[PDB]
């Protein structure tokens, strides 16, 4: 998910809603936003509902994991070792004593 963040959250999604095709944004310039009242903006509705649209879910160009060595550097900075030597000092005995010994 850290590696995904450098592909999904950084830049565009942190700055704008990216998108293409369909009704889209337009410079409607119909009237001043707040002159007669504080609520003139977006009073008018959109022109039509979308029929359909087609686009691939993932590619090497977009939305893929784009893994890097420095993401693994961050991952290993966030190490969580499953056990510690305070157990292995006991478990090592339990290991070696299991054979040749009983």
């Amino acid at each position: 998910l850290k590696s995904v963040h450098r592909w999904l959250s950084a830049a565009d999604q942190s700055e704008v809603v990216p998108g293409n095709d369909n009704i889209e944004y337009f410079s409607i310039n119909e009237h001043g936003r707040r002159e007669e009242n504080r609520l003139r903006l977006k009073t008018l509705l959109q022109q039509d509902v979308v029929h359909e649209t087609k686009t691939s879910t993932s590619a090497a160009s977009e939305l893929t994991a784009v893994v890097t060595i420095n993401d693994l550097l961050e991952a290993c900075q966030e190490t969580k070792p499953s056990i510690s030597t305070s157990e292995l000092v006991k478990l090592r005995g339990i290991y070696d004593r299991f054979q040749k010994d009983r």
């Binding site: 119909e30 009237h31 009242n37 009073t43």
Partner: protein, 79 residues
């Protein structure tokens, strides 16, 4: 719907940047329709289309007094 207060109403400009108004029409024909066939015993190229609903005895302008004469009661425009 209602009255407009010309002293204090929102009179909102909108620009038809998409020329949607050009799709609007008041049913008026621009020209006489193609190839009238008057005097022919038969006519063609007009379809048949199921009613969206039933229509009353009252809504037809002709309404001759016969107790049972017209139940099939089909209709078509001036074409």
């Amino acid at each position: 719907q209602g009255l407009v207060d010309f002293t204090e109403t929102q009179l909102i400009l909108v620009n038809d940047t998409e020329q949607k108004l050009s799709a609007l029409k008041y049913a008026n024909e621009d020209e006489e329709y193609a190839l009238p066939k008057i005097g022919t015993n038969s006519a063609l190229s007009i379809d048949l289309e199921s009613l969206p609903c039933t229509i009353s005895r009252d809504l037809l302008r002709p309404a001759p007094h016969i107790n049972d004469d017209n139940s099939i009661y089909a209709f078509t425009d001036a074409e």
